[PDB]
């Protein structure tokens, strides 16, 4: 147990994870090695783009923020889900026809189709 696998068990214990597989700590160290060597990948591309010698802290600060949109994109925020809902929640509920049998969407949104197959010649 290295000092960063002894600290990876502390992180999962600080969460609600008391019983985990022992393969998890080997997995959470490969993710933590792939992440810092992808940030420092982009932090070396940005140091050469500003044409400096070393990798300063403002390069790593940009490399963190410029890959929080594609590598770790988020579920939509609460201020956006409220505005999408409160215009959807204002149209009234439609009425129901009395006898329509199976009630289904139009035929281009359902999965009912003639569903062919090849002639096994």
């Amino acid at each position: 147990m290295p000092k960063d696998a002894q600290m990876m068990a502390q992180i999962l214990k600080d969460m609600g994870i008391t019983e985990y597989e022992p393969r998890v700590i080997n997995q959470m160290l490969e993710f933590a090695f792939r992440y810092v060597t992808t940030i420092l990948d982009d932090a070396k591309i940005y140091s050469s783009h500003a044409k400096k010698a070393t990798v300063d802290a403002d390069d790593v600060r940009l490399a963190i923020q410029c890959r929080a949109d594609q590598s770790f994109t988020s579920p939509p925020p609460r201020d956006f889900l409220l505005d999408i809902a409160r215009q959807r929640n204002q149209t009234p509920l439609p009425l129901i026809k009395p006898y329509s049998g199976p009630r289904l969407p139009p035929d281009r949104y359902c999965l009912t189709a003639p569903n062919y197959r090849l002639k096994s010649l």
Binding site: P2, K3, D4, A5, L29, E30, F33, R34, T38, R117
Partner: protein, 95 residues
């Protein structure tokens, strides 16, 4: 029809991946494969991909020059996977 012509050629090739293995991984993907030729085509495509990665690894190994037995070490597979969309990054020397 190119796909139909390829299926006619396949009417002889038997893939290494069995039909029960491929026919199970299509079941987790969302359908039960009824026609046993679709299973064959998918298995053959997968076999070609694995063979290409392995052959690229063997070519890097042969290029480094040792010429008796070729070991599939991670040093030959990790650059050979990056030509496709598999980017592994394995650590060493955990401090």
């Amino acid at each position: 029809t190119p796909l139909v012509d390829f299926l006619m050629q396949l009417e002889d090739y038997t893939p290494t991946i069995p039909d029960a293995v491929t026919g199970y991984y299509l079941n987790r993907a969302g359908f039960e494969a009824s026609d046993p030729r679709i299973i064959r085509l998918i298995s053959l495509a997968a076999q070609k991909f694995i063979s290409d990665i392995a052959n690229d690894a063997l070519q890097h190994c042969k290029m480094k020059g040792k010429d008796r037995k070729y070991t599939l070490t991670m040093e030959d597979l990790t650059p050979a996977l990056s030509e496709y969309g598999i980017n592994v990054k394995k650590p060493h020397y955990f401090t």
